[PDB]
RNA sequence: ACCUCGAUGUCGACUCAUCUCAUCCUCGAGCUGAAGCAGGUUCGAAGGGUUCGGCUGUUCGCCGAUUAAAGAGAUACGUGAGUUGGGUUCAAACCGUCGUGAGACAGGUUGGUCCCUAUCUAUUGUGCCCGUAGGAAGAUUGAAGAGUGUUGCUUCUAGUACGAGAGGACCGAAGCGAGGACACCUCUUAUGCUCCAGUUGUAGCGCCAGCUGCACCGCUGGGUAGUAACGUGUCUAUUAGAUAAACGCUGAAAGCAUCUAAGUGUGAAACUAUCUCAAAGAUUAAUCUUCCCAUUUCGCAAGAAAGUAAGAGCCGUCAAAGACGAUGACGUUGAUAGGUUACAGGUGUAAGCAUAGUGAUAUGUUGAGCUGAGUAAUACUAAUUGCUCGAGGACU
RNA sequence: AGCGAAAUUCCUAGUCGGGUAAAUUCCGUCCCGCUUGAAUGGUGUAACCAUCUCUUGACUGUCUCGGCUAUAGACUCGGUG
RNA sequence: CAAGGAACUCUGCAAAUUAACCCCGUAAGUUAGCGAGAAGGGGUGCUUAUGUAAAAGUAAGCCGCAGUGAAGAACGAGGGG
């Protein structure tokens, strides 16, 4: 199962009605055909994958090493690059046409960086409870309190290892699976995908074949509003 | 919050070693030629030629 | 909390914005904090742009942002703005005023800046 | 590279309607809805006054309330929705785009209705 | 979401006035009160002319919720009142002349006994 | 009465759970006076779950309600450098009992003084400098880690079999469930106090009007971006391995039988991965790529001027980032932020004029007026013409 | 005399009726009154209580089910400490 | 803060509602004072004219979410000692 991949930026949240008396929020992801940075066939590389570059910037906004490798590899200066794994069928200078490599109904996975949240409380990302909201006693309403490990002569007289405490919360590249495909727009090279993507609107969105399913095409649910006067 | 002794001397300096003040990277002045500092006004007052700060 | 100084409030902030914009309209130079300069310049340039329509509707619209000073008052300030300040500013699409960053303040080491109005 | 954000509307050229009249939050309308149980399809002419008229192109939802057996039943519908027929009956005059005080209004106690 | 100890009137023509929840049927931390959900109720006020003892622990199905319910079709049916129907021993109601509308959210579960005689199904 | 009387706060309630299996179930299996369903004992066996009320100061204890399930033990009978204290280890007021009496009731109704500005180790994320060993910029990876390891109903298969019948399945497939995670807040909600609008008094803006202050911010209704949820989508699987309970195969000891003595397969909700994520200060610095470097002569050796050029940093704008650091883009050739205009979107016909109205006022001008964040042009303003570290294969 | 598990009952959560699906909380009910009980007075009483108990209509962040808007600390900066 | 309304516990403790004026109405018990402002209901904005010394008020009309319009106003009922 050669899992194909495509990059883009999520440039909108919408809602498109579907069949079975339900509506599904359908987001849009915009990108352009990228240029392959290289391929890896596992003999010494320890894995087989394909490094792809994207976010092409102008020449005067890039360092000498990377851009030099770009022109030596017949590539344009790009701002970012990443390796899509389990996929090596690339050829040199392949312009990425994702609407052909990906059909309209498979269940795919999407990787993205989340929205940063810095240093926040423990009720998020850990889902614990808080102190007394009311009832009129003292002034606590949200604290951790009990962090007991041992209180005695030799019970523990120490603390445990590993804390379920939020560090720099948010902005973590995570992959969520079971996202369906909705449609394509070849004019803008944009793809309409079921379900919103993580992080700020416009962040990196990687769409690949999922692992929960080998790719099951589902038909388009005809609910387009052609009802005019 | 409790302590059962006093602090040492070298570790105390190390804690105060992180208390170093900010540094200032100076810059040359083409408006007048005297000393100046980056992204700030000059000594004479000239700025983008526009002299704006009075010495007295 | 118990009775104490309420620190700084949005009403105080907008009143201070009005004070400085009226003062700079009166004279043409105000020293302040860079953050307050950025806060004030938006209303300042919006009002200057509004003054270029030259009608009594603008006279009514601008009245909620003018304060008096020792030299001039609200009426004198508004008349001067409509008579002489506005006709000069018809050749620039925004960016009417200029903020120049001075050194740190000598009381709390605060980044100071002087805001002036020059075409 | 560039995100014009006009693509938000350039993709909406599929889910649109032009039969919906432009009404307000104080007008009385009607809408026919199909009820298909694979045979003997019913038609419900849900009618009444609107309490909210607002939308952003795909957010064009509206709330309509009917009085049946004294019970006020209110239902919301998106403009871009299959199996509806928004037939306008009468337009009044309202000052806000979302009102909620008319649910206490009864006969001989409702507001004056514009012709 | 309605939690517990809530009082509501009757809709079907049974002959009761006020009823209150005595057991919410569901699961721990359900925290939801969607329509078509069976619940266990006790008639807080039953006039003697009715066929149900005042305080009789019986089974009800909620058809109106002042809290409301967000429809997933893209529409939204909202009730401004809480109402239910008393089901007699399988799914059928103890009332005959149904008064007031009934929602279609319970049609998916069947309940043709009530919906074959109700005023209207929404 | 061994150890603490120059203290080592003991019942709670609360959030958080952790450990064990001598387990309630989700597990698999053996056997059963197990016709079948429904069953019971035990075995391997802890990944996960094991509620909501009243009652007694009370986690003890009663039953109520369900679910497959409401299991037990240990953490100072867990946690007052985490909070009020309800009985109880401040007082008393009162009833009863008793003492000859000050008074005792470990009986009873009531009230009832919880302080700590975080030093060190673990610790949440980031940092000062340095190493990654000619310099610099990147790409990686997986020893070792974390989450995920939850789970019921209905329908079809199927009232089929069995059983005269009643009763009535074990397997599998689909939908619907519950809890939880992850994301977005396109829909809806609280909220969005220098936004708009209805809107009253008082006192200011020379007076009438139209503004202003206070009345929470005068109250009230909404609302740009945006926060969160009650807003809506997914998931708990499949597969390679392996023992475990049980069945074994050929098969001796014990000329057969016999899972065992060699291997063998069926093979547990469990285990390792497959799913997702960080990761080489991981000095086991692992692996690879790219860019840059070429001026004798001395000085404890290669600087006597070159002393990055590869770049990074000081500083400013930004920033959906965001205790300060912080990382990312821009640094004028710059759209990096702000502005002017336009747009999305929201508020809601602005003031005034005109008509009728003695006059509350109704209509036209007008879908007009307006706004802090969302979007587009635009160097209109600012980030300018600056400063610091920083090049030569030292060594195998 | 009066009242009786008491402003007081070891047996006791004694028992009965009801409110309560759930009620030693509330009331009345009987009584081997361990040790109730008339001048350390009783029974009941008309309003009221900066007393308590339970039921009731009304109000809910009281929890479900979390935060919101802004500051004040907090956090950097400078001065004292 | 939509919805539940005391389900959290000894847990109605800060928590909302009734408020100023005017018009009805008010139970039991009572020692005849009361209870009682019980409880429970309704109106307050502007203009015209009338009232008067004004005052509220009176009749007619007007609007919208309201009309002590902002800032100032009592929650109780029942049982027991």
- Residue to mutate among E71, E73, E76, E107, with most A CBs inside 10 A, is E73
Those nucleotides of strand F lying less than 7 Å from any protein Cβ are 10, 14-17, 51-52, 65-67, 69-70, 75-76, 78-84, 116-128, 136-142, 146, 177-189, 193-194, 197, 205-206, 210-214, 217, 221-223, 226-228, 230-237, 274-278, 287, 289-292, 310-318, 320-323, 325, 329-331, 334, 338-341, 344-351, 363, 367, 370-372, 374-378, 380-388
- Counting Cα atoms < 13 Å in the Cβ hemisphere of B39 gives 6
- Separation of alpha carbons D71 and E80, rounded Å: 9
Terminal CA-CA length for chain A: 48
Strands A35-40 and A16-18, sheet pairing: unpaired
- Integer-rounded Cα radius of gyration of chain D: 17
Please, are residues E51 and E94 in contact by the beta-carbon 8 Å criterion? yes
* Dihedral Cα A112, A115, A116, A120, nearest 10 deg: -120
Residue count (chain C):
119
- Separation of alpha carbons A47 and A88, rounded Å: 10
- Separation of alpha carbons E42 and E59, rounded Å: 9
- Residue to mutate among B22, B27, B36, B40, with most C CBs inside 10 A, is B40
Task: Tokens for C89, please give them.
Answer: 């500013």
With a CB cutoff of 8 Å and minimum separation 6, the contacts of B4 are none
The beta-carbon neighbor of D75 closest among E76, E99, E120 is E76
Distances (CA, A) of A144 to A117, A122, C25, E24: 20, 8, 54, 32
Residue bearing tokens 């004479």: B44
User: Count of CB atoms within 10 A of residue E84's CB?
Assistant: 24
**Strand locations in A12-137 (E):** 16-18, 22-24, 26-30, 35-40, 49-56, 78-85, 107-113
Please, are residues E13 and E114 in contact by the beta-carbon 8 Å criterion? no
* Dihedral Cα C3, C5, C11, C13, nearest 10 deg: -170
CA-based nearest distance E72→chain A, Å: 5
User: Count of CB atoms within 10 A of residue D52's CB?
Assistant: 17
- Separation of alpha carbons A86 and A210, rounded Å: 12
PDB resolution in Å: 9.1
CB-to-strand F under 7 Å, chain C 24-83? 34, 38-39, 41-43, 45-46, 49, 57, 60-61, 63-64, 74-75
Q: Which residues of A96-132 are buried (b: 16+ CB within 10 A; e: fewer)?
A: bebbeebebebbbbbbbbbeeeeeeebeeeeeeeeee
3-state secondary structure chain D: CCCCCCHHHHCCCCCCCCCCCCCCCCCEEEEEEEECCCCCCEEEEEEEEEEEEECCCCCCEEEEEEEECCEEEEEEEECCCCCCCEEEEECCCCCCCECCHHHHCCCCCCCCCCC
Number of structural domains chain D divides into: 1
Tell me which long-range contacts A75-81 makes (C-beta under 8 A, separation of at least 24): A75/A35, A75/A37, A76/A35, A78/A35, A78/A53, A78/A54, A79/A54, A79/A55, A80/A53, A80/A54, A80/A55, A80/A204, A81/A37, A81/A51, A81/A52, A81/A53, A81/A54
- Separation of alpha carbons C119 and C98, rounded Å: 9
**Chain E residues inside the 8 Å CB shell of D76:** 71, 75-78
CB-to-strand F under 7 Å, chain A 138-167? 138, 140, 143-148, 150-153, 155-156, 158-163, 165-167
- Separation of alpha carbons B11 and B7, rounded Å: 8
Residue bearing tokens 């074949």: A209
Residue spans of the domains in chain E: they are 1-122
Residue count (chain B):
56
Domain extent for D48: 1-115
In a 3-state reduction of DSSP, which class is residue B47? strand
CA C109 to chain centre: 24
The beta-carbon neighbor of D18 closest among A28, A224, A229 is A229
SS3 content of chain B, % helix, strand, coil (to 5): 15, 20, 65
Task: Tokens for E73, please give them.
Answer: 């079709």
Please, are residues E94 and D92 in contact by the beta-carbon 8 Å criterion? no
User: Count of CB atoms within 10 A of residue C14's CB?
Assistant: 13
In a 3-state reduction of DSSP, which class is residue C108? coil
- Separation of alpha carbons C14 and C39, rounded Å: 9
Backbone angles phi and psi of E71, in degrees to 5: -75, 140
Backbone angles phi and psi of C19, in degrees to 5: -60, -55
- Separation of alpha carbons E86 and E41, rounded Å: 9
In total, the C-beta contacts within 8 angstroms joining chain A to chain D are 57
Please, are residues E70 and E80 in contact by the beta-carbon 8 Å criterion? no
């Amino acid at each position: 199962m050669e899992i194909r991949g495509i990059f883009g930026v999520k440039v909108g949240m919408s809602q498109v009605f579907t069949t079975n008396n339900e509506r599904l929020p359908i987001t849009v992801i915009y990108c352009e055909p990228n240029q392959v940075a290289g391929v890896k066939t596992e003999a010494k590389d320890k894995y087989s994958a394909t490094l792809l570059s994207f976010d092409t910037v102008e020449n005067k906004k890039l360092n000498k090493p990377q851009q030099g490798f770009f022109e030596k590899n017949n590539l344009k200066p790009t701002k970012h690059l990443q390796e899509i794994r389990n996929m090596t069928g690339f050829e040199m200078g392949q312009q990425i046409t994702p609407q052909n490599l990906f059909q309209v109904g498979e269940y795919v996975d999407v990787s993205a960086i989340s929205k940063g949240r810095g240093f926040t409380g423990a009720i998020k990302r850990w889902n614990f409870k808080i102190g007394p909201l009311g009832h009129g006693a003292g002034y606590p309403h949200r604290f951790q309190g009990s962090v007991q490990a041992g209180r005695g002569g030799a019970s523990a007289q120490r603390v445990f290892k590993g804390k379920k405490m939020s560090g720099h919360y948010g902005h973590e590249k995570v992959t969520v699976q079971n996202l369906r495909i909705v449609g394509f727009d070849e004019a803008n090279m944009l793809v309409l995908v079921s379900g919103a993507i993580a992080g700020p609107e416009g962040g990196v969105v990687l769409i690949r074949t999922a692992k929960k399913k080998p790719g099951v095409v589902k038909p388009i649910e005809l609910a387009v509003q052609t009802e005019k006067a | 919050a409790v302590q059962q002794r006093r602090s040492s001397k070298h570790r105390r300096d190390k804690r105060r070693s992180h208390d170093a003040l900010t540094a200032q990277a100076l810059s040359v002045c083409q408006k007048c030629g005297k000393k100046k500092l980056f992204h700030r006004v000059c000594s004479c007052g000239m700025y983008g030629d526009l002299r704006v700060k009075k010495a007295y | 909390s118990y009775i104490n100084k309420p620190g700084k409030t949005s009403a105080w902030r907008v009143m201070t914005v009005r004070q400085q914009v009226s003062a700079v309209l009166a004279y043409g130079k105000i020293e302040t904090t860079l953050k307050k300069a950025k806060n004030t310049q938006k209303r300042l340039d919006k009002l200057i742009t509004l003054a270029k329509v030259d009608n009594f509707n603008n006279r009514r619209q601008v009245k909620k942002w003018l304060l008096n000073t020792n030299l001039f008052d609200v009426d004198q300030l508004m008349d001067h703005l409509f008579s002489k300040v506005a006709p000069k500013y018809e050749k620039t699409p925004g960016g009417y005023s200029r903020v120049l960053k001075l050194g740190p303040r000598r009381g709390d080491a605060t980044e100071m800046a002087i805001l002036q109005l020059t075409d | 590279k560039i995100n014009k954000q006009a693509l938000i509307d350039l993709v909406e050229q599929k889910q649109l309607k032009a039969y919906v009249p432009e009404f307000s939050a104080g007008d009385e309308v009607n809408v026919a809805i199909k009820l298909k149980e694979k045979e003997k399809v019913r038609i419900q002419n849900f009618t009444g006054t609107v309490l909210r008229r607002r939308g952003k192109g795909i957010s064009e939802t509206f709330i309509v309330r009917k009085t049946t057996d004294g019970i006020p039943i209110e239902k919301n519908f998106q403009i871009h929705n299959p199996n509806i027929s928004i037939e306008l009956k009468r337009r009044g005059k309202v000052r806000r785009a979302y009102i909620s005080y008319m649910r206490e209004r009864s006969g001989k106690a409702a507001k004056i209705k514009e012709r | 979401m309605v939690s517990f100890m809530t009082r509501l009137n009757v809709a079907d023509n049974t002959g009761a006035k006020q009823v209150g929840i005595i057991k919410v049927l569901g699961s721990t931390r359900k925290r939801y009160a969607f329509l078509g959900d069976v619940v266990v109720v006790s008639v807080k006020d039953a006039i003697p002319s009715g066929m149900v003892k005042k305080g009789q622990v019986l089974r009800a199905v909620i058809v109106r919720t002042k809290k409301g319910q967000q429809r997933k079709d893209g529409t939204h049916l909202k009730f401004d009142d809480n109402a239910c129907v008393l089901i007699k021993e399988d799914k059928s109601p103890r009332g005959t002349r149904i008064f007031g509308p009934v929602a279609r959210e319970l049609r998916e579960r069947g309940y043709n006994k009530i919906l074959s005689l109700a005023v209207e199904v929404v």
